[PDB]
Symmetry: D3
Subunit: 261 residues, 6 copies
């Protein structure tokens, strides 16, 4: 069944998420021949989690020497050494501070000569390892996942996507508030790619995600709220802060707070 | 306009109600010529409030030597010394334990020769005092007030009412679970009579009152939920326990919890 | 406050309305100096009601010798002896079969030299009688009243109105299915005119009126459903057939069906 | 796919359910080697059906000499000869009045030394017969099935469950209205166990089940209403009384009333 | 997954649908041994599309010399040469004006001696060709498909159906507005038959279809709205006019309007 | 009753508002003895209107000589010459560029020795002129008006208000993104003060105001959405851009778009 973890502060969400990733890896006991495969996102709430994971690694609570990562997405036609590329985000905020092997980091390359070939290569790389064991991600204010469109097929695969006007505006702040400077296209994993993971953990902090949280927990599966499709996943975890609880009914928070005791 | 007091336990609800009545009386400074006029109901939750008022009176925190009371209702064709009459409920559980003057207790007489004249005398008696300063009451699971029907006119007056099938069944527990023994009619104040008070305090405890609480706080005015009409009252107070908050949104409880402190 | 009469067939709706008009007249005991003032509409369901009223008059159960009528509306620039005028509908189907005095029939004149002057004369005529005691009417699928727009001011008065595209289409069947032949304008009473009546009885038969009936009975007051504003009227009666109850909940019909019996 | 049978009285509900069970058995024509497997619940609503089933047996309209029964649940650490055990409920109200073979009655044993082993033995016993042909059951006010929590996996199996505070409160009436006297744990079939039956008949009587019936018939599949998951079952039957129809739309009751007869 | 094409006029809807059928056929490049298989409906909106298909054929933009058609339904016990039979509708409005081979026209025969045998023969004929490549259809005001009941199993097959009271009334206009003159039964494809097609194009024109469009586009899958089940189809296309958009939210139309351009 | 003006761009919203203010003043023909009284707010969309009003003044299309203004609010314990004070906002962006007389500019003083006396003088000053002829304002994301709380009494008066946590965060961007630097309290007009104006024009631009616009146009009056109470105002105007329409139904936008043209 769906696991809903209602918490109060964004730090508690990040600390909980990091702890969950630690426990799965440490229970899995990964080796070189049998690595743990981790799906990873970008953004503000992930950032706090990566920071917590670095702190836990600096202690003696985890090693990434046998963790393989796959990232959700990357901009197209943007140099991968650009400060605002998703390559740069991952290496600067995470991979450069942990003991992961450089050949176990997978991030879509948006500068290939053939974007379809690159997307198929990504899907193949995942299959070569078997399956992603834990995919961490976020959710949009409209319930969309990664750069997938809000009404995306639940069996969509990794493909090239044209960024929406709203996505262009949202990300403008990373490119000098210039909509014309945001890359028009990106490579993203599909909803099917996400659903193929053994466990999907979605992190939702902020009042702007409260409607997405209501759709995920209280609503029925709606094909206009991609996050609601995770209700059909065998292990769907949703962690949220108090601001994102504001649209739920009192009985909903009561039920899940007490279940998690 | 509307004050919503969300509390946890039924005990806290009665204590809050008792304290509020104390403060209203003690601020008002009643005299014999200028008494404080209190509207009073019957039932389980009021009983706890009357008990707390008695304890506060014994603690010399209040005197009723200048409080005039009006009760909501009384059965018709039931001897007023019968255990299950509302005369008996009020005197045995409250008036016989406080310093109220016997001539300041007003309760509808359901044994008159003329129920319309009796109801009219009651409305006149209130007018002779000016106005009820604080009317305490409860609310039905369908939002009805006193013996008024769930679709009662917002200008209904004191009148005779035929008890509903649900009310007959509900009150059967007081007459040996015999529907045939519950009085068929009762004299009740109208919704207009209630709204004419200077302040209306409604007490709502129980999971069975959660939908009525949602209608009063979150919903628009609906003529099928009489309690919602109190939204237009100049001083409408609603006190409720945890079980009755369960249908509200987290943001609704949050807003009013913080306002009151 | 609101009376809802849920019936099965359109015949039952018409008979109930006729009986109600009969009973109001007979209780009022009208005289020449103090006549009973009746507001009247046109249409299919009214036709059956007028037929039933004629039968009751022939059965000497009522006299209209002291009833004054005001009609809702009339086409502009249509000869008043034209078959499709509302003058013709009223006289041919009703007034020519009863004992009403010819000088007590009031119908807006859509052939005046000054429609604003004409509309003002109509409002003045009504005030000269005091108030309409019972106004019968229908309701549009969008809850609109007469030729008033669905968002009409609740204080709109009798005025000239440009017929909507939907009203032109609906009424084409009376002019050889030719939208170009329907009069473009009409003189209509306002929503304020309707609410000034002592009692408003609206008759709603048909599956296409089920949403309007739901808005009037179950919904809160919405200014886009003019019929719902009648919830705040002192005597609002709504009579409907089974097809018009299909959007209501079983509890709504149960409460009112048992109240009326 | 889904059959909804709306009736008026609890007697009609029990009569319909009993007849359906009769018809399935008699069509199946069970033998000793190929028995009919019947799943059975506990509670007030089942009781009337069991009484009706006894009467139909007395009327020689059915024989249980070749029916094998499996019950949903039983208390743990309560002697099975205790008046309030479900063993006692089934035997006193049903099995002691019909011709079932004593070795064909299966009820979870809450007094074993190994509750997991007992639960597995129960699932195995079902497997040994093939599958349950008809599972009769009730529904909680929150749509839960048997002792499963409203957030149980739709593939949950027979297991030990800690009774919720709500179930403890509900069941206090059988243990002197004392929450501390209700057994803390119980053995219950899972939602998966129920869904593995060839047909599921849910019985819903009472005003307190109106919201649950709305969730099963009118709502989409919601993972917080276990009863709504039965919409995906190949043969889902829901029988309900008039009090449980109160939250449905008139069009829903109309549709199914006409379809079923 | 789901394609929603919001257009303005009914003409544009039929023109779009015709063009889509043309393009599917021309890409498929059908041969006699490998024909293109087309599913076809009856009604007002299909009529305009067939007219456009005839115009495009005269313009030599398409040939049906290798198109095989299957129709949704046909009346029972009505001579197939009757003006109001669906045989007549299809031949008069379509087949008599195109170059389809007469042995490639498939329409259920409601005059067989064995309606179950006929329905199985129809299902078998579809199987003999493999699958329907494109199924065009309409939608009822309650979201039902063909003569399937609004609560039909999503795996229903071609079968005989008793026409509902509402269906009898709707079709009365073709039989002298006499409910008793409409055939009581019809042969119809099942919902499973429709879902087995490679692509399903539903056409929805009219204000009376706006609620069904909202259920298909905005709502979750509801087993009382058959059209909503098409959300789970691999290629579901819904084309509608402005009147059918009136119940959608502005953001819904905006999203899909921009997607298609 | 209520005018809803749906437009596309924020420029059009400000231009319409300015034009409306122009036309009201010019029709009124104000003199020194009989001035036009204008209520004014602060914020981004108002600023664009003030620029347009200055442009219209430079074009000699209006004079503000005989115009008296009243502002909604002002911070307390902030020097009125501070860049971020509302005194500074109004003078720098409006009053210093028009021909208003310095003795006709009214703005609450948040630096008085007695804020209650200060509030009363403000209400009295309004009464001394008679009534505000046109009050322009904005609306919060929760429908709140000025610094009034979202559940404010509809008869609240000018008073001191403690800024909510949300208001502190929102305005932090004007004080170096420092919540601790935003003044804790503010002087604000009450909801009653707004309703006492002869006309209320609310301007709503932005996707974050779409829910407030839906509450004002489509919803019933809710005491938790202050803007919805303006439905009972004699002349309530709401102007909005395309981003703020996104939550309305297509039929709502269609109706009012056609009404205004």
């Amino acid at each position: 069944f769906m696991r809903f973890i209602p918490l109060q502060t964004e730090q508690q969400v990040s600390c909980w998420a990091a702890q969950h990733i630690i426990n799965r890896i440490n229970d899995f006991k990964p080796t070189a021949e049998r690595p743990f495969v981790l799906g990873l996102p970008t953004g503000g709430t992930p950032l706090k989690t990566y920071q917590e994971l670095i702190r836990l690694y600096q202690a003696g609570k985890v090693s990434f020497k046998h963790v393989v990562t796959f990232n959700m997405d990357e901009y197209v036609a943007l140099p991968e050494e650009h400060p605002e590329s998703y390559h740069s985000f991952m290496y600067n905020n995470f991979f450069n501070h942990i003991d992961i092997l450089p050949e176990n980091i997978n991030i879509l390359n948006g500068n290939t000569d053939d974007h379809n070939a690159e997307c198929h290569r990504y899907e193949e790389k995942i299959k070569s390892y078997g399956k992603i064991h834990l995919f961490m991600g976020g959710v949009g204010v409209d319930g969309h996942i990664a750069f997938n469109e809000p009404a995306s097929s639940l069996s969509s695969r990794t493909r090239i996507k044209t960024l929406t006007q709203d996505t262009l505006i949202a990300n403008s702040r990373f490119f000098n508030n210039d909509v014309t400077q945001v890359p028009k296209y990106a490579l993203t994993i599909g909803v099917g790619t996400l659903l193929d993971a053994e466990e999907v953990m979605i992190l939702a902090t902020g009042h702007q995600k409260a409607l997405a949280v209501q759709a995920a927990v209280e609503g029925s599966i709606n094909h206009l709220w991609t996050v609601s499709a995770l209700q059909m996943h065998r292990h769907f975890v949703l962690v949220c802060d108090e601001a994102a609880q504001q649209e739920l009914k009192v009985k909903t928070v009561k039920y899940f707070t007490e279940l998690e005791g």
